């Protein structure tokens, strides 16, 4: 009952996003709501529509990838203990990103293809890999019907929680062989790591993998925008706070 509640709360995740438009293109500064569990490019059509008056996104002059869940980007671009109740009055939590245009594409990020097919294909192939990690093969996801594969992604676009849960569970590993975990530092020196954590014969706690987390370089473990106790079980953590792309993301913050 609680895993469902937890997942619903994650699906409801939503952020105030300030989209600063590059003069080169209140139309200069868009204010939109974007869920944590989705990609920024899924909202490009909404951004273009508003400004009927290459390109990529940037945070504080640094190009940002689009292939990470918005919530994950937020965790590493916005640098918690403070409850809403004890929070100073009227603190505005938001993400400011810039839509810029240029002659040459920034070298470190996958370019935005603006084809409406790019995001879905990437995301689906990635779940195929997450399935490989969890089960040892992509059988479960490849066994989905064509209708189901399309509806799986459709749920991300329309926010259909029921469909996303039905399909993500179908393909989700009874007991993972390994945990699909990604550890990263703040993007404001950036380090990212995908450690190999086996579940065979063990039941690791966050503290148990302290070695891996620390290899990425006094630090607070943030997952889904919240602090996680070092004694929580990895599997539990993954099964509950993994993002809409199948990966569990941990962000290290001071």
């Amino acid at each position: 009952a609680h895993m469902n509640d937890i997942k619903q709360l994650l699906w409801n995740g939503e952020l105030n996003v300030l989209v600063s438009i590059d003069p080169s293109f209140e139309i200069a500064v868009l204010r939109i709501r974007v869920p944590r569990e989705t990609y920024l490019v899924n909202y490009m059509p909404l951004i273009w529509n508003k400004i009927k008056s290459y390109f990529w996104f940037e945070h504080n002059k640094t190009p940002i990838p689009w292939n990470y869940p918005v919530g994950v980007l937020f965790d590493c671009l916005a640098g918690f203990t403070t409850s809403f109740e004890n929070q100073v009055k009227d603190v505005l939590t938001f993400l400011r990103i810039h839509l810029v245009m240029g002659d040459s594409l920034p070298p470190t990020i996958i370019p935005i293809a603006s084809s409406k097919t790019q995001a879905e294909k990437f995301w689906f192939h990635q779940w195929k890999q997450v399935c490989f990690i969890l089960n040892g093969s992509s059988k479960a996801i490849m066994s989905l019907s064509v209708n189901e594969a399309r509806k799986f992604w459709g749920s991300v676009i329309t926010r259909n929680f029921q469909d996303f849960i039905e399909i993500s569970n179908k393909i989700s590993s009874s007991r993972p062989r390994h945990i699909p975990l990604i550890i990263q530092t703040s993007r404001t020196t950036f380090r990212i790591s995908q450690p190999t954590i086996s579940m065979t014969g063990v039941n690791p706690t966050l503290k148990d993998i302290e070695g891996d987390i620390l290899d990425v370089k006094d630090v607070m473990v943030i997952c889904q925008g919240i602090e996680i106790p070092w004694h929580m079980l990895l599997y539990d953590l993954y099964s509950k706070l993994r993002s809409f792309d199948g990966f569990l993301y941990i962000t290290l913050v001071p």
């Binding site: 609680h2 709360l9 939503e14 409850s83 809403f84 009227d90 919240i226 106790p229 929580m232």
Partner: peptide
């Protein structure tokens, strides 16, 4: 309960992130 802790923290997160959403 660990889940009660997560439920509580996620609700708070969503509340903080939703504050002043009328400006967006």
């Amino acid at each position: 309960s660990m889940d009660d802790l997560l439920i509580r923290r996620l609700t708070d997160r969503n509340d903080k992130e939703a504050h002043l959403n009328e400006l967006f």
